[PDB]
Paper text:
Contractile bacteriophages of the family Myoviridae (i.e. T4), R-type pyocins and the type VI secretion system (T6SS) of Gram-negative bacteria are evolutionarily related nano-scale injection machines that puncture target cell membranes using a shared contraction mechanism. TssA subunits are enigmatic as they possess a conserved N-terminal region of unknown function, previously identified as ImpA_N (PFAM: PF0681226), whereas sequences located C-terminal to this region are highly divergent. Consistent with this, phylogenetic analysis has suggested that the TssA family can be subdivided into three clades (TssA1, TssA2 and TssA3). The structural studies presented here show that TssA1B, TssA2A and TssA2B possess structurally diverse CTDs that lead to distinct overall architectures for their respective complexes.
SEC and two-hybrid analysis of the overexpressed Bc TssA1B Nt1 domain indicated that it is monomeric. Analysis of the crystal structure of the TssA1B Nt1 domain, determined to 1.80 Å, revealed a monomer composed of 11 α-helices that are organised into two subdomains, an N-terminal subdomain 1 (Sd1) connected to a larger subdomain 2 (Sd2). Sd1 (M1-P113) is comprised of five antiparallel α-helices (α1–α5) and contains the ImpA_N1 (L8-I31) and the ImpA_N2 (D55–P113) motifs. Sd2 of Bc TssA1B (L114-Q251) contains six α-helices (α6–α11), of which the three longest (α6, α10 and α11) form a five-helix bundle with α4–α5 of Sd1. Residues from ImpA_N3 (R123–R133) form the start of α6, a helix which includes a sharp kink between L124 and G125. The C-terminal helix of Sd2 (α11) terminates at Q251 and is thereafter followed by the connecting interdomain linker to the CTD. The sequence conservation in the ImpA_N region across the TssA clades implies that all Nt1 domains are closely related and adopt a similar fold, which includes the entirety of Sd1, and the N-terminal part of the first helix of Sd2 of Bc TssA1B. Mapping of the 34 conserved residues in the ImpA_N region onto the structure of Nt1, shows that approximately two-thirds are involved in packing interactions in the core, with the remainder located predominantly at one end of the molecule in the loops between helices α1–α2, α3–α4, and α5–α6.
Numbering used by the authors: -7 to 38, 52 to 254
The structure:
């Protein structure tokens, strides 16, 4: 055929969760490989990250050569950065799948039964997921898209300008205003809000499933998702407020 539209090919969870071989379900540990190094380099930023490269390459290794929790965590982050909330959700579905199907074999394998160290990249992902959720756009209008973090910043700016009206120019410079966000929200479609609230609920479902699988598998050594959950609740409450203001039932 001719090249498919869009930036990456469908990630294909069935294929991602198919064992590499019957003899070695998770394949070998590929940390030392050229392909793994290239992924690590692509994600490095102060150098800008190449998130598209990460999606294609981490996905390629997972589908063909190895089941690796580091790669799955990195693919989750890169999908979130490339695709938004739905990418974060697909990543969490993959993580849950790998813990369900490959607990005994996925790389890195445990050393001295240090399950905590084995899951360190997952523990990092909780904090990272809070950042990613707070960057999800709550508007798409007037040549801009504003996040939860943007709303909080705009609130903080309005407060500081009330306290310090002499420096209002410098306080407001290069930061969102409340009026600006409001105007962007006013010309954001209903369709945008349907999908945001649906996409947020599907994220919550994936987070719950992953956490549940981790209590089963890891017990006392399960990473916390408290940061991620606290963020989700802030984002969803704002999302629902903006939708209702815009006429969403
Ligand atoms: Ca790119
Ligand atoms: Ca811990």
């Amino acid at each position: 055929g001719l090249v498919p539209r869009g930036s990456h090919m469908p990630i294909n969870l069935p294929e991602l969760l198919t064992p590499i071989s019957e003899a070695s379900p998770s394949g070998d540990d590929l940390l030392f490989s050229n392909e793994f190094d290239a992924i690590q380099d692509a994600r490095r930023y102060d150098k800008e990250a190449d998130w598209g490269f990460v999606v294609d390459h981490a996905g390629e290794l997972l589908r063909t050569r190895t089941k690796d929790l580091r790669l799955a965590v990195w693919l989750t982050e890169a999908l979130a950065l490339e695709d938004g909330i739905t990418g974060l959700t697909e990543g969490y579905a993959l993580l849950e799948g790998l813990c369900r199907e490959f607990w005994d074999t996925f790389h890195p394998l445990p050393e001295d039964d240090d399950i905590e160290h084995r899951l360190g990249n997952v523990a990092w992902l909780s904090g990272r997921t809070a950042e990613l959720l707070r960057a999800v756009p709550l508007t798409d209008g007037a040549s801009n898209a504003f996040s939860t973090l943007d709303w909080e910043v705009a609130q903080h700016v309005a407060q500081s300008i009330k306290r310090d009206p002499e420096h209002a120019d410098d306080i407001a410079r290069g930061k969102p205003s409340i009026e600006q966000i409001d105007a962007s929200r006013r010309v954001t479609s209903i369709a945008f809000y349907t999908a945001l609230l649906a996409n947020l609920k599907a994220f919550e479902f994936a987070l719950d499933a992953f956490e549940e699988r981790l209590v089963e598998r890891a017990g006392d050594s399960a990473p916390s998702f408290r940061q991620a959950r606290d963020a989700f609740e802030t984002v969803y409450r704002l999302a629902e407020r903006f939708a209702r203001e815009q006429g969403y039932t």
